[PDB]
Automatic annotation (TrEMBL):
Record domain Ubiquitin-like: where: 16-87
Span covered, complete protein: 69 to 153 of 233
Signal peptide feature range: none
Domain of life: Eukaryota
Full protein name: Uncharacterized protein At2g32350
Length: 94
């Protein structure tokens, strides 16, 4: 909620293509390799209806629950399969 300032840590870098898999839809997003987990969910939140805190990102067995860490911390490269498990079972959604 706020605090989202613009920052260009590296302009001379190629953004990677991550595969965002929901329990319904599948789409690819261009994100930086030093992108924060929060900033990953930010971009996904812009695409999908799911709120950031409710959707959990799973990368090849690792739960990306640390909002403060970056993707490089988990070792995420291009064509990665990010499985998004939605933690909302009281009211279902597509």
């Amino acid at each position: 909620m706020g605090h989202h300032h613009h920052h260009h840590s590296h302009a001379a870098v190629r953004k990677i293509h991550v595969t965002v898999k929901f329990p319904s839809k599948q789409f690819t997003v261009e994100v930086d390799r030093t992108e924060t987990v929060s900033s990953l969910k930010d971009k996904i939140h812009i695409v999908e209806n799911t709120p950031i805190k409710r959707m959990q990102l799973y990368y090849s067995g690792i739960e990306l629950a640390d909002d403060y860490r970056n993707l490089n911390e988990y070792g995420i490269t291009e064509f990665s399969e990010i499985v998004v498990f939605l933690k909302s079972i009281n009211r279902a959604k597509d």
